[PDB]
Each structure stands twice: as C-alpha cells, then as structure tokens.
Amino acid sequence: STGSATTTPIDSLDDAYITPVQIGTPAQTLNLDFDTGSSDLWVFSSETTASEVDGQTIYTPSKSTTAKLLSGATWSISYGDGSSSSGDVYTDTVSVGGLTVTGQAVESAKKVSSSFTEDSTIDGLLGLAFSTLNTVSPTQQKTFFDNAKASLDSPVFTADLGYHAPGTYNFGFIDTTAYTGSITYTAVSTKQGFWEWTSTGYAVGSGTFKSTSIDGIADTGTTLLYLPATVVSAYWAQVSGAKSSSSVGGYVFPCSATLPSFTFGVGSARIVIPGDYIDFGPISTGSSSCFGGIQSSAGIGINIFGDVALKAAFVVFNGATTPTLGFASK
Ligand SMILES: O=C(CCNCc1ccccc1)Nc1scc(-c2ccccc2)c1C(=O)NCc1ccccc1
C-alpha cells in the first residue's frame, strides 16, 4: 500500500504545516501537524477542557463506531518549546492520503497548553519519530508509520514541504518526479528516538564551504533551523544591522535586508536554503525589525533541522531495519 496527502502552511510565514487525517467511522477529518520530532498522535477532542478549545476541529470518539477506549491508558507530553498536552487514549481507524491503519492509538486531549488553544488551525499532532518516544502509559503505543510500515510497498515516508505553498507527505514510495538530481542518503542514530544525523558542513551565501560535523535532528514539527552559535553568528554577520536580541529571543535583522542563502552538507551533496526562506517577518505588527529563521541551538541541547531547512529539500525518512535519511534538491 501507499498513501499521499497534501500538507499546507497554516499562515503566510510557513509557521507550521497541516495535513488532513481521517479518524474513525464515519470519518472525522482533522488537520494535524506531522512532526518527525515526536511520537504521539494526539487530537483536540470532545474531552478537551472547553475553555481550552478555540476554533479547532475536534475528534468525538462516541460518534465513531470503530473507536475503543484503551483502558487505563494516559499520555502527557511536553515539547522542547515549553508547550504541552495530556489526556486519555482510544484506538480507532486512521487514514492519511488513502493509507489506512486499523487499531491506531489516538490520544485524546483532556488538557492543552495556551499555545495550542491559541492556534485554531492545528487540530493535533501526528508524530513520526521513533515509537520509543511515545508517551502513552502504562503500555507505550506505536506511531502511525510504525503501524503502517509492514503494509507499505517500501518502508519509507517522504516530506516535501513547500515555501509559501502546499507540499506533500508520501508513505510507501519515493516520487522520482518530485526532486532533481539524486537523493543522498546519510546515517541515522535512533539512540535519542529522533531522526538524528550528521551534516558535513555549511556555507553562507556565496562563501566557501566549511567542512565540519553538525549532529542534529530532521524535525518537521519545528519551524526554524537551530544550529551552533558559531555557525549562526557567521550567518548573521553577513546581514547589515542583524543582532541577537535577548528581549526578542534570538537574531533579528532589518526588514529592508536581502538575506544570503545558507547551504548545508549531506555527505558530499549540498542543499541550498534561499535567503527568502530565512525571513520570518516583523517581530510585532508594523515593526521594521524582522525575526530570523536561523537561530542558535545553544539553549536547547540539540541542533534542529526544522522546516526552514527541510523545505529546501525532498527528504526521505527510510524506516528500513537500519534507518537512514535521504536528501535531494528540488
Ligand atoms: O518550532 C516550534 C513551534 C512549532 N509550531 C510553530 C507555530 C508558530 C506560530 C503559530 C503556530 C505554530 N517549536 C519548537 S522550537 C524548538 C523545539 C524543540 C524541538 C525538539 C527538542 C527541543 C526543542 C520546538 C518544539 O518543541 N517543536 C515541537 C512542536 C510542534 C508543534 C507545536 C509545539 C511544539
């Protein structure tokens, strides 16, 4: 089997991407944020504290003839950015782009943090990291991909995120029309539960490429590119007037600037992030200070190849017995 679904930016800045997911019988379609940096499939629901729902579409398990309470199971997750959610668990039928899994754990939120409430466009998350990170207790559950994998034509999924435009998540096949050149594969460590890999270096604009190992995660659920402070300083030094603002929480730059590109290495291959991808717009409405899309990972403990990087590539998440990651230009 295979599946193929369009993923759509939630706003004009590509802050996140939502993908429609069918849950239950008859189907209830929710728009979920596919997150290769976490491993829980959770949704706003008929159980979510009413004051914490503001415009989201909810899953109502009592209206699904295939829903079953997973007795005694609870979940609770904290994200790297401080947001959180928690609740109880059903199993139900879940379909993405024509690919169906029966008995998928659907984590129903009883509580969500304010950042989730405040984003009416995201109805929940669909985790695509390794199932070792799943938070369901006392019996840890599998991701959608892990449940689907044996049925897929090939044990892979691909992320093809657009810049200011829709893109695609495919399951079970590689669309050879969706990228240029060849796909370069690179080793993955699953030790921390992530799609963790090592970039071979970087360049800023038309500058010379610096060979250096940068260990980080391929994370579709993180907006920005978080890299070591040395790399990030070298980037922003090429933008007149850019500075790190402790009050804003990262590098800002004049909105009148034209940003240089940023290149990262994948083995001997190179992925170029155009400068425009690195502009996240005014820090507040009407300001002429704009927020940068490349930020330091120094406070985080891990480098993160988030959407800013991934949307410059066609990315293969290869879930073979020894997982690997592939990147192609597009
Ligand atoms: O990049 C983001 C925000 C993603 N949503 C963007 C958005 C912006 C405006 C409006 C609506 C949505 N957070 C970061 S920054 C760094 C991390 C992180 C990830 C893993 C480990 C450590 C830190 C994260 C992070 O925790 N990402 C997972 C996540 C996914 C969705 C919601 C909440 C957390």
Side-chain angles (χ1 to χ4, degrees), residues 47 73-77 85-89 107-109 137:
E47 302 178 327
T74 60
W75 61 280
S76 180
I77 192 160
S85 52
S86 61
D88 59 14
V89 185
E107 304 172 32
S108 166
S137 178

Side-chain angles (χ1 to χ4, degrees), residues 21-62 64-67 69-109 112-141 143-190 192-242 244-284:
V21 177
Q22 283 71 50
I23 308 175
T25 310
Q28 299 180 39
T29 298
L30 276 65
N31 297 326
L32 306 187
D33 184 350
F34 284 22
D35 180 15
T36 63
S38 68
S39 304
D40 288 49
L41 191 176
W42 73 259
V43 297
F44 279 78
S45 76
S46 61
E47 302 178 327
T48 308
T49 301
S51 62
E52 297 178 353
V53 182
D54 187 6
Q56 295 81 10
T57 295
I58 63 168
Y59 169 58
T60 301
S62 67
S64 176
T65 57
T66 42
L69 180 74
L70 185 63
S71 179
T74 60
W75 61 280
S76 180
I77 192 160
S78 300
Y79 295 101
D81 71 11
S83 63
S84 64
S85 52
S86 61
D88 59 14
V89 185
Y90 294 78
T91 57
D92 208 341
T93 302
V94 172
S95 298
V96 174
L99 172 66
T100 300
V101 168
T102 57
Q104 173 65 44
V106 176
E107 304 172 32
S108 166
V112 302
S113 66
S114 61
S115 51
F116 288 114
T117 298
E118 287 161 5
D119 182 8
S120 64
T121 70
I122 290 175
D123 304 321
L125 267 65
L126 189 151
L128 294 166
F130 291 87
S131 295
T132 54
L133 293 179
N134 177 267
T135 77
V136 177
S137 178
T139 305
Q140 185 176 64
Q141 302 294 303
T143 71
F144 175 81
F145 180 55
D146 259 7
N147 285 320
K149 182 185 302 190
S151 300
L152 296 177
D153 292 354
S154 181
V156 304
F157 66 92
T158 64
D160 180 8
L161 301 177
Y163 166 69
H164 292 176
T168 305
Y169 281 103
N170 290 330
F171 291 83
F173 72 107
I174 289 163
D175 179 358
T176 60
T177 73
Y179 58 88
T180 63
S182 54
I183 305 178
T184 297
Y185 290 87
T186 196
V188 165
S189 173
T190 65
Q192 295 189 83
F194 299 122
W195 293 92
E196 187 172 2
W197 64 291
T198 302
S199 173
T200 50
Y202 69 98
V204 176
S206 66
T208 65
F209 185 84
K210 173 75 164 179
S211 297
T212 183
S213 294
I214 306 171
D215 178 294
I217 65 167
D219 187 358
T220 58
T222 292
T223 312
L224 306 186
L225 173 55
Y226 295 88
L227 292 173
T230 46
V231 178
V232 174
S233 180
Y235 179 78
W236 289 108
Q238 299 304 309
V239 179
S240 296
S244 184
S245 169
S246 54
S247 63
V248 177
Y251 280 89
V252 296
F253 68 93
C255 297
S256 58
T258 301
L259 297 179
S261 63
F262 184 88
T263 299
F264 61 94
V266 182
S268 63
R270 303 291 178 253
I271 298 293
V272 179
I273 305 170
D276 286 356
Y277 290 26
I278 297 162
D279 184 348
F280 278 76
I283 61 173
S284 294

